[PDB]
Design a binder for this molecule. Structure first.
Ligand SMILES: CC(=O)c1cccc(NC(=O)N2CCOCC2)c1
Length: 460
């Protein structure tokens, strides 16, 4: 029975509004309703992994697991295995997989982050799950960010706290936050970003939604605008939104948006908004294709509609050779030529690099680089031809060309990372000098760039 080189992943996010779900929620797992929907001809084909994020979830873990498993069994005639479930307050993540994957899944991690301080600490935050699927690392984050149209900056702060403090994936990757630890990272939830238009335009907005004319609304969506200005979710992707705003509905219909200020809303307007989102970030040159992104039309217990997204995602096998794992394969090497980091820092310490990769027995520290002044104020750290030759565990090009090198640039004075990035080994050529490049981030904000050349030797 061969190992897969692709899987499909279902991501669901639903703010349940503290209400039990209706008896049938299968449309959610089938990607049926509005937006980019799944073809009917696929309805019986199970996804490999289903990741369900809820917010304002009033159910016990047991109650929700029973509904989810019975839903999937009805659709697919497959009894899914529970990979992980984790709850913070009323924020929950469930991971289910086909039974055939049980012995492909390992290193399961769960964590949560509570956002805010005092007043603002007690119901918002995130839960997450990570695991290995054969040779591929997968991370999943369900966040419920701060509400309210005038709190986009708070949401952005909530995002940075979650990606700094959520402890998922390989703890040996110590310089790297969750935005660098996984082959594929999916981040979803009630992100709570709003359509920033004047209150007086509420009925105009509703009109536009009835005509399925979303362009002049999406141009004011705070998540799209904040992302464009590099304030949040830097280097993440989102599929085009082609479904109506998923908030705020009158319960038990979808015919009405309930936007007017009420005591129950803290006297805040809730203009129709795309609160409920799925984003992702995958390592460079790894296959990831969104095959659905939409909302259900027939699940009406909440003031939010469920959102679905599905993905084709490239995966690799758990590779064994005669040599690695357990030794190096002298027929393999990774060399770096003419490399330099450009950093936004005003500081003047020496810097060194760390190279981390599951193709190495352990991480590699470089010598200190040579600091120069850039012509526009910048710090340029030159490594020239000084970087160590990296010794992969396996030389087979079928393995090595699918790997990635994480790079941290660290202060000699403090050993703190000033920037993290990732280089793909999916090169156009081996035994050939080729340009490489990554942006560098720290706490998910841009801090610089790393560029140079690579020369990869495989056994072929
Ligand atoms: C740089 C930047 O972030 C940017 C800039 C312009 C447009 C978009 N569009 C999206 O992000 N979309 C399309 C609509 O539905 C969600 C995803 C993004």
């Amino acid at each position: 029975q061969p190992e897969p080189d692709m899987i499909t992943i279902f991501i669901g996010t639903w703010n349940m509004g503290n209400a039990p779900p209706p008896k049938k929620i299968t449309s959610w797992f089938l990607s049926k309703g509005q937006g980019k929907t799944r073809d009917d001809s696929a309805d019986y084909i199970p996804h490999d992994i289903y990741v369900i994020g809820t917010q304002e979830d009033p159910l016990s873990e047991k109650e929700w697991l029973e509904i989810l498993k019975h839903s999937l069994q009805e659709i697919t005639s497959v009894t899914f295995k529970t990979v992980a479930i984790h709850t913070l307050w009323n924020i929950r993540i469930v991971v289910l997989a086909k039974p055939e994957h049980e012995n492909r899944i390992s290193h399961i991690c769960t964590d949560n982050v509570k956002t805010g301080i005092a007043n603002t600490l007690g119901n918002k935050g995130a839960v997450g799950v990570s695991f290995m699927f054969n040779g591929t690392s997968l991370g999943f984050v369900n966040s419920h960010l701060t509400s309210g149209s005038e709190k986009k900056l708070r949401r952005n702060q909530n995002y940075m706290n979650i990606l700094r403090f959520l402890a998922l994936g390989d703890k040996k990757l110590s310089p790297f936050n969750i935005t660098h630890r996984f082959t594929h990272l999916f981040w979803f939830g009630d992100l709570n970003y709003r359509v920033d238009l004047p209150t007086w335009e509420a009925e105009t907005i509703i009109q536009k939604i009835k005509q399925q004319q979303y362009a002049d609304l999406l141009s004011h969506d705070q998540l799209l605008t904040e992302r464009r200005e590099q304030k949040v979710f830097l280097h993440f992707e989102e599929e085009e939104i082609t479904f109506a705003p998923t908030y705020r509905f009158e319960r038990l219909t979808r015919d009405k948006y309930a936007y007017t200020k009420q005591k129950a809303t803290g006297m805040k307007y809730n203009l129709p908004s795309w609160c409920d989102r799925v984003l992702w970030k995958s390592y460079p040159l790894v296959h990831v294709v969104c095959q659905s992104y939409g909302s259900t039309s027939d699940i009406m217990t909440s003031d939010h509609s469920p959102v679905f997204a599905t993905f084709e995602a490239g995966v690799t096998s758990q590779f064994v050779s005669k040599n690695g794992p357990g030794t190096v394969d002298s027929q393999g090497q990774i060399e770096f030529l003419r490399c330099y980091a450009t950093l936004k820092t005003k500081s003047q310490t020496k810097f060194y690099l760390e190279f981390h990769s599951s193709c190495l027995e352990s991480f590699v520290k470089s010598q200190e680089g040579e600091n120069e002044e850039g012509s526009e104020g910048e710090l340029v750290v030159k490594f020239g031809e000084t970087l160590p030759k990296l010794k992969p565990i396996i030389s087979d090009p079928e393995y090595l060309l699918d790997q990635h090198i994480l790079i941290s640039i660290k202060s000699s004075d403090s050993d703190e990372s000033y920037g993290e990035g990732c280089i793909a080994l999916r090169l156009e050529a081996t035994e050939t000098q080729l340009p490489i490049y990554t942006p560098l981030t720290h706490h998910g904000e841009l801090t610089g760039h790393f560029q140079g050349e690579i020369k990869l030797q495989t056994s072929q």
